[PDB]
Structure 1
Amino acid sequence: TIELSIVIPMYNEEDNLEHLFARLLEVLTPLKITYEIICVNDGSKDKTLKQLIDCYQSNRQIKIVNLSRNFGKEIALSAGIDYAQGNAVIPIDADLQDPPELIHELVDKWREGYDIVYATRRSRQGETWVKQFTAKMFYKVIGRMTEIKIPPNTGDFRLMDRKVVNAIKQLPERTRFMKGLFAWVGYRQTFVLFDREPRWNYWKLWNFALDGIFSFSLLPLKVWTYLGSIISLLSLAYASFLILKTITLGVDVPGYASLMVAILFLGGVQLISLGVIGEYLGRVYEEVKARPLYLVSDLWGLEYLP
């Protein structure tokens, strides 16, 4: 069988093949376990596939997944995990920014009785205040969104057990927020503190933030249609107050004060409509993601359902 599966998404990653493979063989032979290296070429434009082919010729542990197009790092990672058959699957980066020597340590934490072992950086390490505070705010928001409290400073370097991988493959979602989905499974999780070696705008970021906020939970859709419906009721109210202030207290003010009532009433009514729609939209969202109701960790006395 295959015990470990190192998944490497690669796009324009030539000139890094030799050093990365040397480090991986250096750190994976002391483990004395049967491993595999699933390298997912994400439509590289340079001579990366040629060197990947040569490496796969030389070594029987490298397996290449060649995507038709450049789908992206997240999608290439998803393909690699889908084609990984090891008991533990470790996504790693091809630029070696996250050290591979920590893979060993990750394996140990996986053998302590854990299922997800995140690799959390010591501290931002670079990324001036402008980024640390934004990361803090986003992490607090998402931690309030979920009920599992994924660790801060988590990236795409991690260890997932076969249970975790099977659970992730059990979610048929196209709008994916990986951190939220990894929290949403909630197995025996942990994190290993690693320090990145001493060696993005707000257009690629803001889009990622919106994808995390909207494609994971209904909380933006629930907080709204709750702020609306606080107003609207406060607009239908005071619209009635204006009705009962013109009916008593004869209207000696400007002759078209009733316009205000209209501006409130329809508006408030419209908001209610929106709220209702939003609620149902959220329900439809939950229905179209088709998430499983539950995930089973272990069974005693029962075989697993098909």
Structure 2
Amino acid sequence: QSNATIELSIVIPMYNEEDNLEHLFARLLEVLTPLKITYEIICVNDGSKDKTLKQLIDCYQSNRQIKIVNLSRNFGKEIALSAGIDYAQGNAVIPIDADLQDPPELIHELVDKWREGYDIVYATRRSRQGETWVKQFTAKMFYKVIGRMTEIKIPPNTGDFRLMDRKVVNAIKQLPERTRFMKGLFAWVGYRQTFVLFDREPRFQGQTKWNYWKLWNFALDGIFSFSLLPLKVWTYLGSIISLLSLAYASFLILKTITLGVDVPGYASLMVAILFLGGVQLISLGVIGEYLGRVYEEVKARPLYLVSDLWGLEYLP
């Protein structure tokens, strides 16, 4: 009997991952055989510049569970993951890395948490460990900032290693977004979510020169995709500055009448500067409010997500 129903999809983005395919596939097979479930392995070639696709085709010829999504260009790991998840058909989908920095054995644990009713199972590191103090402090500050500014609650130490139920995968597919912060998006599609702790081996504990410009832009993407306060604060700042300018002008007139001293030219210049700056900041704040509305409209997120229905059929 052929099930024809994939229970588990393993999505691996690959970029120059030759001389890693054999070990990765051996470990994955060793982990996935005891699970006794139908599975597929979607390997997404993200424009590799070496003999990765050739070895992938060699493995695909012999192993029926291997499928290849060959992207035209190198789009990056996140976009390769998105493509692999788009082409995945399992009831659960697990993104994993080809270098096996995240132990594939934990897949089993994830599957267990998936069978207890959880729709998202994050694989979270117990501690950051090998990451430098600067990286840890910046990550902690970013998470605190995004928690304060936004209404989403991104769990700590969560990477791309996770299990997503088919329902969560379809919810993520319902989000047409070109500027995606995946951590915030997974927090936003709030289903039954849990986490499984795992200690990453010292082989991959810390070895990375982080490009802090890329990290800064990633944090900016996360903040801007889920908060509009940076656009709203300016109208109130302009109102405060204009009020200060008006109060200063009133005080200058009061000193002119009660002391008989004409207002100095620099004081009038300061009043005009503050008033014009506040008016322009109010205009910028109104523009920012309307631009936030436009951004919300063009992100085109669903108003809601239905997780379960009783007595009703799902709307197309």
Is this a same-fold pair by TM over 0.5? yes
CA distance in 2 between counterparts of 1:15 and 1:247 reads 86
Question: Structure 1 pair 225/93, CA: closer, same or farther in 2 (3 Å)?
Answer: farther
Superposed displacement of residue 253, structure 1: 5.3
Superposed displacement of residue 125, structure 1: 2.2
| 5+ residue gaps, structure 1 | none
CA distances 1:87-109 after superposition (whole Å, capped 9, x unpaired): 10101111111110000000000
CA contact (8 A) 2:119 2:191 kept: yes
Question: Structure 1 pair 298/220, CA: closer, same or farther in 2 (3 Å)?
Answer: same
User: 1:253 and 2:245 equivalent?
Assistant: no
The match for 1:117 among 105, 109, 121 is 121
Question: Structure 1 pair 56/228, CA: closer, same or farther in 2 (3 Å)?
Answer: farther
Higher helix share: 2
CA contact (8 A) 1:9 1:76 kept: yes
CA distances 1:204-258 after superposition (whole Å, capped 9, x unpaired): 2122122222233213223444444333333344344434544554434534532
Superposed displacement of residue 162, structure 1: 0.8
Most deviating of 105-114 and 257-266? 257-266
Most deviating of 227-236 and 23-32? 227-236
CA RMSD of aligned residues (A): 1.6
| 5+ residue gaps, structure 2 | 204-209
CA contact (8 A) 1:232 1:271 kept: no
What's 1:72 paired with?
Answer: 76
Question: Structure 1 pair 246/77, CA: closer, same or farther in 2 (3 Å)?
Answer: farther
CA contact (8 A) 1:176 1:216 kept: no
Aligned to 2:238, the other structure's residue is in SS state: coil
Question: Structure 1 pair 155/227, CA: closer, same or farther in 2 (3 Å)?
Answer: farther
What's 1:4 paired with?
Answer: 8
The match for 1:232 among 231, 242, 249 is 242
CA contact (8 A) 1:6 1:37 kept: yes
Question: Structure 1 pair 169/256, CA: closer, same or farther in 2 (3 Å)?
Answer: same
With structure 1 as the length reference, what TM-score do the two structures score? 0.95
CA distance in 2 between counterparts of 1:207 and 1:143 reads 18
Corresponding residue pairs, total = 306
Question: Structure 1 pair 302/124, CA: closer, same or farther in 2 (3 Å)?
Answer: same
Question: Structure 1 pair 239/38, CA: closer, same or farther in 2 (3 Å)?
Answer: farther
Question: Structure 1 pair 255/136, CA: closer, same or farther in 2 (3 Å)?
Answer: closer
Runs in 1 of length 4+ with deviation above 6 angstroms? none
Superposed displacement of residue 146, structure 1: 3.5
With structure 2 as the length reference, what TM-score do the two structures score? 0.92
Question: Structure 1 pair 242/294, CA: closer, same or farther in 2 (3 Å)?
Answer: farther
CA distance in 2 between counterparts of 1:211 and 1:40 reads 24
Superposed displacement of residue 302, structure 1: 0.5
Aligned to 1:63, the other structure's residue is in SS state: strand
- The share of aligned pairs that are identical, in percent, is 100
Question: Structure 1 pair 252/127, CA: closer, same or farther in 2 (3 Å)?
Answer: same
CA contact (8 A) 2:44 2:71 kept: yes
